[PDB]
């Protein structure tokens, strides 16, 4: 692990609860859509924070309007663990804030291919 | 507590290699990834697992479980996005 360059993963967002404590991460797929996990248990009261590097710049605290939790998600098996969040106010896209592409249903990321993961290591489960 | 945004390059691992690590908990809607030693631990719950598909970063997985502690060397389990895209497309339109 290592420190990312400031504004290098511009789709990376933090999910803070009403109290302002980072509980989960997220990915901007559009100006008003964020994708995250279902086990996070995201609420309408939670907020999405974009343009963040140092958790401790031009950040955007965005409000959540609609929460689309996958209806096939059970906490026992933890299958279909995904949630899509429609933002109330859209994110102002800039140098440090922008979206990530989503793959097709037919696309494949096979074993051995080097991918990247980012965040502040805060796990819910 | 990492104050700054962390990153880590990790490989995808096969279902068979992930199944021997866990067992019946792994299913077709879960992508595994991690050649461990502090790599999958950087991602938050619901964080991105991004892969370069034709010169552009694509969301392959979403952090689900397995990446709880950096000390454990088992593969990290992510939500296979491609398998969940049919559900995703239904609400985005």
């Amino acid at each position: 692990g290592e420190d990312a360059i400031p504004g290098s993963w511009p789709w990376q967002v933090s999910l803070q609860d009403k109290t302002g404590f980072h509980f989960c991460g997220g990915s901007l797929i559009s100006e008003d859509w964020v994708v995250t996990a279902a086990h996070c248990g995201v609420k309408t009261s939670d907020v999405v924070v974009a343009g963040e590097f140092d958790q401790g710049e031009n950040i955007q605290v965005l409000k959540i309007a609609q929460v689309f939790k996958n209806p096939k998600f059970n906490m026992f098996t933890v299958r279909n663990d995904i949630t899509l969040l429609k933002l109330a106010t859209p994110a102002q896209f800039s140098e440090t804030v922008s979206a990530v592409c989503l793959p097709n249903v037919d696309d494949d990321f096979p074993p051995g291919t080097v991918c990247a993961t980012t965040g502040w290591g805060k796990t819910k489960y | 507590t990492p104050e700054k945004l962390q990153q880590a390059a990790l490989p995808i691992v096969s279902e068979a290699d992930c199944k021997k690590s866990w067992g019946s908990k792994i299913t077709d809607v879960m992508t595994c990834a991690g050649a461990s030693g502090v790599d999958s631990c950087m991602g938050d719950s619901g964080g991105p697992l991004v892969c370069q598909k034709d010169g552009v970063w694509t969301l392959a997985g979403i952090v689900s479980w397995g990446s709880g502690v950096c000390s454990t060397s088992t593969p990290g389990v992510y939500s296979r996005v491609t398998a969940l895209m049919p559900w995703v497309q239904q609400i985005l339109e």
């Binding site: 360059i5 400031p6 504004g7 511009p10 140098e95 922008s98 | 990153q7 390059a9 694509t58």
Partner: peptide, 12 residues
Amino acid sequence: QACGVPTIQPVL
């Protein structure tokens, strides 16, 4: 309006 193409490139 770009997707997966940051204006600041990631250096792993």
